[model samples]
Target: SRRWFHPNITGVEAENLLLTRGVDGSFLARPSKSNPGDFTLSVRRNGAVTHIKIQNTGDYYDLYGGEKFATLAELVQYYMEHHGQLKEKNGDVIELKYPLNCADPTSERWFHGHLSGKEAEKLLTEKGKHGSFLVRESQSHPGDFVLSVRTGDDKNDGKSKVTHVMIRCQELKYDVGGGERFDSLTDLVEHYKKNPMVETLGTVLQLKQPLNTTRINAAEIESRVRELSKGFWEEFETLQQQECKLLYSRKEGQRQENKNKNRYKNILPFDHTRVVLHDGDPNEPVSDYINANIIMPEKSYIATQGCLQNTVNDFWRMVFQENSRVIVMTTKEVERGKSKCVKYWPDEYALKEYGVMRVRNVKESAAHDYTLRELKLSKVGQGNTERTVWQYHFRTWPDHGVPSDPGGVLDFLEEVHHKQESIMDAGPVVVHCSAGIGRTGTFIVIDILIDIIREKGVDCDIDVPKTIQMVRSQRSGMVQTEAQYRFIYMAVQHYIETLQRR
Candidate 1:
């Protein structure tokens, strides 16, 4: 039979030699970079690394002959077995000497050469007569241990001899002093249940709070008003000669300024006239005659009876494409002017009257139909109500809602929505009165706010201020009245409260 041999590739044989054979293997330890503590670790038979956590000891790198040990197990064994030596002195008294210190005079000098063996015996008592035991085993039987050292001036110094030492279980260094002593790698952990690190980062990342817009600083507001007014005056100077056909004056400037100031003062919290008093009747209409709802950019033409033809033509031009249906709603003077403005109007009307008007010509194709719907304040409520003469209902309070209230705006909204829904499917509806900004802004705001509240929920952070800000950015005095802002706020608040109740 051939001779057979097995090779141990696991390094277990070498590990066993280090654990049991070497004479000076028992003194090695791990070094801490930030603290004066030494430690060691070992792998047991079960393959778990055994951790030896130390306290009150100096760094392993600082020890004499520290480099000789290859691993923590070897170092730990070396420390337990052959390092400290105790010699019998007279009458139960003993002198303790470090084995390394005796092995080299330099090492002896570093450790102050000698210590009391009586104290060494006391410190080593739990390890039993063999003076070798696992650290965890020694920790369970809590007892005071002694440490002795040679006093030092130099290597053999007598002035610094450390005679007495006491040791007991104490908190880990990391747990004490708020854990400041640990090295960077150790301190980065979230060990102690406190989130100081996260809170610190949060503070660093936070944005500064937003500015409050509701406080209405009087001085700042006044200053802003003056700046806006001055700019308006400059524009008005040119506009008077161009559009209004009237001269500008200081009185007009003062009046404009006062109007702005009063507008800010009239903002209300709610629309007080929305309640319906009966089942069949609709809510009161919004006051139409309070002011013109439409505002346009300054033009080089004045609004007059003589200009009605051009005005209606311009209005139709904005809404109608080539060969499209047009509805001209105005007074009789405006109705008569439409015929002269468009050459084929008389012929088309006569053809329609005789029933010879081709359906294709009046339909959605190459040809278009134009109808003139008259608007008269007198005929809306009293005369023949054959046609739709939708008059604006506004409160006559002169402020917002007081004496003669035209309070049916909510009902008007429903009617307009229904009418627009039918027309918009065919084409866009071009709505105009005179200056369109006031009522136009209110109408647009109401439609947008209602849609948003229904779809996005009541508490959504829509930028109402920024929306109005954009309008003002485009037209300097886009929403110049406090009543407008008040109505907007009130409209939103009412819708929100309704949603909440539901």
Candidate 2:
């Protein structure tokens, strides 16, 4: 009697066998340098690499750990089954159960299994016991997933310690403790909800309370703004003298381009706060003249200058890279014969290509105070892959003055809020005006105060001065003028009145 076997073969024959099963040719069988009759099996999960050696026995193939298989298909299947047991250089075991399918490609896998940043965050919120972990998809590598865990606190400032782990989308498995891979984030999160160890990996931290401690009301809101406006010019001059190195252009050649086209001559995007263009050369670094507005822990806004003729391409690149879903334009392209902001978006039914981005105006609607346009954006070589970006152009805002009535600005803010709530997965709302400080800051202050009011209640103490101080800390000269600062108080008063009526 003879022992049963599927097939026997050489390295070439075995390679052909695995190739038929949709494996990538790059990861297929390769001749071993040291041993004449052995071959090495190479595969990658997420960004990490793994290799297994297969000894060519006379009748069958011997896997790395002496496991014998009659055919190439069996050997491949065995490796996939036990991939999770294999350890990497960092002492971290492979969390993937199945081998990456080269025939499928990461693009196709990401398209079918991809989740937006917001969606990923929501899923983690439900599944993650610790508030420290965050889910973010790679901007440069579209489909790549990253699981960020707060290891410890930065003792100096008490910021959360951050560590990032590459999560293979295809090989992700449920936390039920089996060797099965999850097809989507929802499934993986669901599994982790029941199995805490798999989700957190023993990196859970205690959650913190809201930053607002004082109770604010209508009287407090008015008083704070009044105090801030008493010696406004003196305060502005003091802020001007502060060393703002981040706003200085890293490249000397781009310094001329960084100069603003308005009276607030010295104001510029901080090098530290400016959004760096992804994949740009170091010498000719492309950056959007924008600053990150962190209202609270999770809530944020990107306060940026209105796109200049030369900076138009950089603006769109920032939009795509940040995965921004809404754009709030406070100035018109041309206001009072001055170029407040160049028309960066495309005309209705027209396709405009800027750098590597292809933008098309899909729909447009007109309102009393603003014009709304739905723009679809995609990369040049990304085929039909595209994302929707909403543009809210407030037409009535004056460059030298504030809105005549707070009603229009408040109404516009309400519309933007509604759209953002509808698509909770969308990125930060990009807000801008002439110089990106005065009106832009005013709008953001109102928006953040409104959110705080809603969360803390109508009687809550709204700290207008503290909020403006926070904004100025991130970008110099925020809430630029006394009039604009006063406008914020008036706007908040109007909002509270409306809330009281409701």
Candidate 3:
């Protein structure tokens, strides 16, 4: 469900948004534009914008003359569920339908923050590799940490087990239940990576690798990136090696019948969330296969490869099924003599049909780093029930490596959201570029982090590796290169500057 709270935005701005992007029942709650420490519910009721002032005094919240609520969300939810409970001055009821989602950042992948011993053991047992170790806050002691590791220390039963070592914090020093202490986690981690722990049962618990986390505070990213000024590649090298440990089933896309549908035979969609063709040849068993995966936070994204010659029909079919309105193309059709993605859509002023969907390019507008194509979509024999699809073709992303500057990419992303947000019910934004992981992953990472920063503030925390790890679970090999990973830092740096100026 979309979050109802919009921390920023004023009265006129909410009114304009409700009128332009919302339906009659759409609504959102935001801080009151004029009154400090107060909130206002802006809803579009019966085709008009309604700004209902909320009372925030002492410890209760309510309308001037209704039942009070302890929390803002509860107040809005009560009115929504209890229908006619919210009335107008003339005695008409205001109905609230959809809550616009206005959405945490910072966990190191290896640092599971507050993970329990059981949970950490399960993670290390399932997703972790031999010698994989992660640090988490001790459940019993708030400030202390537990270092969890997986190893080959199998006893007579002949099975591997996870080992947990407590690293306590006291008097500005850290220790692993021993006299040897260190000042920083870095120092402790470095010292332990070279040492092996011997359990009371005589089993040797080794510390082979540090499991990384994907979280870091956004405000801290500036300094975090600075720390990487010398170790950027080092961090990326760790991420690169960890890719081999990310094991998942992809046999569905590898079936003999579906091989041609893939851009690359080795790069196949995970069986868990690959896009299945809605309309396929009834007799062909693998007809429903496509090289694509659904990604999330919102589950509002579909990452796919550049359309294969025969898969264009499948591509449009996937879009039609997903009800996607925004097609974010992060690459050109041809790059350095290599064809990245096929020209799936028709040329300007031309209309084409693929499978059951018909696409017509209506308008083209070029931005600083991309080209926006306003395309019209229609169904076969559906007659006049046409819809619009936006295709933001990012043209300037250097083919050699990451973008020289991340400003263009951020600006390109800003334009995409301005349009996507305007269409309230718009489907998951369809994002693709060549292999559909590298730049596509980078773009989506920046977009997600930027959304959090906007929702919470610049002070919000974000972890790129953590974000990439989550995204990679949906589609393999996202943020493919070390340079691409570093570019994410550059993009966020540029983004914060814009937010600061605002």
Candidate 4:
């Protein structure tokens, strides 16, 4: 019933369908003429008609680099359900209030092909308001239509009820056997909704909000991330609910000796799979356990808490002992009047010693999204054990949600990866935010997910939920909020868009 997918319709033909018969918010998806294999959506917003491009990267479907959807139908459904989220470059909202149809396949969003009476009742009551209704093929009467409408007022809540009206066809004219008939099914609905139908018992059935049969479920979370068809908020709330189900024990970071090492107590690194230092600086109280929780989702990544006053010594200790070459910081030294991370690295052209290792901040440079610092590390009386260490301090991370523009974060990553991949046998890249779970988890997932599509080809699906499940298993609470989680999806989508253009 996806009549909107008008096959090979050109720009002129698409406009004719919308302006000639349909109203504003009417749209259709057609093959892109500018670039074959890709798709274009032509919509009539106001008096003017506008065409929006859709790219099928084989990996996933998106408005190129925006929120990703698995299929064209799914993407269209999402925008229709979530009004105002779909907007033009000029910030004008492209509200998809109604989908268009001429004939043939009959793709109206409110039309449910053959939904049973019981199924319609269940669906309508679950979320239908006073006037929510849908037209479905009557199961008992083959070709006849059954219109299920939620009865009563809005304040009645879900305790109200559903009223089913029957519509039959005679000589191609649609009617409800009440002597009132219309030419098309849509025409019948329009007339009846405005006229209002009343039974002999004095119950008036009205149709207002049309129930979309394009109901997305949890099983469809493969090429998708959000839990609900409403996209961002609902999907994010769903992830937060599901996040509770994926929790593991964090006994190691909760230990008395390592308790203060964590900037926040609740965010403890999971036990085992931790990067441990062999010998501690004896002068400092038993330094064997620093909360540098090592998660081996390979090329080996470490997720550690912020540089705490007590843990800064062991923080550098984790770097030196692990033989890691690059450290990625997703936080600043100070953010929003609070200490996000300690100034753990030495100043440029200055030398500092942490326990036994001597760290020299060789040079510091700034980029569009991150600051790069080069450090020369060596040990006292150690024979030629000197090494070069690089740190990428990302500049644009916010305390809540991420930057609307993912370009900077992505470019920062491109810079970080170039140096990381250039090094020989470098240890795992250490990534940390304040608590080490949120942004830390986000950066790691994006890095790995981008690598997945690049190595396996664009045909490979980028499933962030499945990837996060595996990651949090290695380190608890990896990829923290829905914002960070959503950003991970955005970053990967943006990366692929660039790759396809290049």
Candidate 5:
């Protein structure tokens, strides 16, 4: 009466067959559902569920009745008790797959199956005080389970969840390179246990900067972070993401095939960068300098809404010369919210005309949209990469979802880059979205780092953590939350992987 069985392999039939196994014996049999001829069988005694595919039949039932087998012991016991005559061949050592039982929220081992749900939650919360853990990716081999741990989040949710953890045998090394020797599950588990310090210190060193900041000071930051853990550096050295970094660099930087003006430069002022406006205390000034030493550049683009007026203006005044072209981007409605920009510069154009004329679904305004104007300016400057273009997508009139896509910002940059190729080859491109450090930092760094890694062919070399450390070393924690850190890591990883494949 077991609710789950192989496709064609029935409850009693499978049980009966499994029961008749000997000391060294293993059985290979196909499992299918209602229509036997409809599926192709792939049988493995390795304790994992065998993949059963339907042959010529339509996708009816789709193995609807099949369920994942639980516990490796059950499968082992079945073979031991029934097939006495069969023995494992010298080279034929198969394995059983173990489910990632951590999915059940209520289970004790739910979080990586090592601790109970309550206990895991408590552990995570405690560790998360420093930062949350991101699960990068996991795989299963014949014997072991590896849960790669990354730290940070994007939504500022404050919790860094593990994105991936692989369970497999220790023998098969899942590297871009190759090696194999593990033969048992126990060996795999023991291996991960012995090396519980998953990621490398070097990788962590690369992460010295706030997860969501820009400002490349990886070397110095890495030196500081190394003071925290020697273990972290070791595993991080072997991670697959590093490979993606290397691959991406080769694709983007070397060819430099397309000539475009306004090419971005590596002129970011700080070794690390962050966006900061205010803390919760209303009494606290909107802008506070902690460890920050670098001066905010004069003429930097400031994107704002209602409440950030004073802080933004003060920041610009403190950083730039009086006549510097201080671009302000805001939606019309939000502009009316007394966003400090209007009060400081009443003569500023309300609507802007700019950008190459292309027939599109969108319409243009008359007073000169700040972003369009800046884009046009950068395009016209040819070869001068110093111009910073900023855009604020929301407005005061109609409230809508925030425009926070890094892709969109990059697309605009590409257009500008295309137009400026003859004039500018290298320059910094700054991006800001509201809070600055999280979304803003996320947008800029992904594009910048991806471009850098794509050029150098050296993977894991762009130390993000170090960059954050540099920013924080000067400006306090630019990426204030653990979630933001994790998000940056995930985003960078995703971009690298995607670019590598392309």
Candidate 6:
């Protein structure tokens, strides 16, 4: 007497339904004890003594009233449709709520009273205390407060661990300090009301910065840049001598192309950090190129040499493997009748294969200072999978020279940044020009500094020299010449001025 039922729900759909309906449990399938070939679906709840069971026939499930389901999906859908409404043991329906938004009054209260790590340290110093408590906005969890307890001496040890408790601000009203390790403050409060330990958590923590006061003006920034420019060579040479492991030898396989093209001989790609090409074989020797930037590590750039005819395929392999979305080419393919970079991409609607990788030019657009190209890349032997890559060629930048004006470069950067934000889920932006150190380094330095300024404010102390040092540590010969170094300063100056104007 059973009717065949076709369940349309997928496993993901079933799980999502349970989550959305505020059910905190799981469903399991097992072979039915009575029937040899049939299965039974069981739903387990916290308070229920016996799990709710549905019998499965060969083609359908028996829901007791001649109901048959063709698949697990159908059974889950039927269960959700009938019993998805969640209720407590007290017979009241459970309600779910969203996390407090940034605009909420409770959120504002938490942020306004927040103390930074430095501020907390200062307060401890003033009190002549070894440890103190502070509250700050949680970096890992947005819209939450982090209660930090500085538990050890600061100056004597020079190192200490701060116990952190992440809590929602609204929960503070209910005496909840959040997390399992932290007892509900309300429970503590109720217990202490008649006991001796009646200290407020905030008072026990001894919790205790001016807004926009640290911002540097345009004139001050220009003065600092001038001072740094004087000993630029001394600083640059010091960075050059530091032993950075992120490099490769020119003798490594196809990396021979880098011999004459590279600005420095010993300054090659690092073997450990360089992008490796799989090409369907694990034993295949990896390429000796592609250096990742440490600044903005999450969405950093992979700086590498402009493709020589030999390494062109490896370049695309790196692109595909890294899932790169944008490529910023600061040098033209041919400049002053000299080859800066071999044209690695294809012409419009043209398909070019480099080794096992196939690259097709899908679209092209020209701007005043640069050419924008949309490319489709796929692996030859792999399945019919394809990816889109954006190639930005800044045509006006001369070989071993900075742009005549920073405006054009900045505008081009703005466009690239806009496009990069849209495709952040993709890999790092691939940036190259000739040896991939001069213009490439300059562009990266400017971009990273701009981000730092935006995050820390212009008046905040920014160590430009240290930033360049960090970049060179990752990839040799970054910010190649003094002129390039000077250009970074100029670009930062212009950027800050632009911000002021706005």
- RMSD (Å) per prediction: 38.7, 25.3, 25.0, 17.4, 22.7, 24.6
lDDT of 6 by residue, 1-502 (tens): 0111112233344334344432444444333434433443333345321123455211123443223332333344334544534344455432211111111121111122445555644544443243344446556666555554544454545544444455554544322353332233323322323332213443233232111111244347877667766654444333332322223332442265335433333335544445655553355444434333323432588878777776676677788887888999988777669686888888988999887789889989999999999988888877576878889888887544466568888888888887888874888888887666667878888887776676766675555656776676666556655456667777878878787777
lDDT of 5 by residue, 1-502 (tens): 0112232355345434444431112233333445432433233354332334423211011221221111112232333343432233343433322211111111111124333334334544444322333221233332334433335543336445432345443334332112333433323323434543334433220111112212333223334334424423222211211121111111121122211100111101122332332322355333322111231321122221122332333333222222222232333423326332222222223322122111111232333222344321222223342233222232221222223333444444344334333333322233333323333333343444555554564244565654443333332123332333444554454455455566
Sorted by TM-score (best first), the order is 3, 4, 6, 2, 5, 1
Clashes of 2: 9
- Angstrom error of the Cα, residue 341, model 1: value is 18
Better of 1 and 5 by lDDT: 5
C-alpha lDDT of residue 403 in model 3: 67
TM-score of 5: 0.30
Full-model lDDT for every candidate = 0.27, 0.58, 0.74, 0.71, 0.31, 0.55
lDDT of 4 at 331: 86
Question: For candidate 3, lDDT tens digit of each residue in 165-235?
Answer: 88898986788977688865545765777777778887777777655444566777777788889667545
Instruction: Locate the minimum summed-lDDT window of 10 residues in model 1.
Output: 1-10
Compared with the true structure, the alpha-carbon lDDT of candidate 3 equals 0.74
lDDT of 6 at 364: 91
Off by over 4 Å in 5: 1-371, 375-406, 409-436, 457-460
Residue 441 miss distance in model 3 (angstroms) = 1.2
**Top of the candidates by TM-score:** 3
Q: In model 3, where do residues sit more than 4 Å from their true spots?
A: 1-214, 283-285
Ranking by lDDT: 3, 4, 2, 6, 5, 1
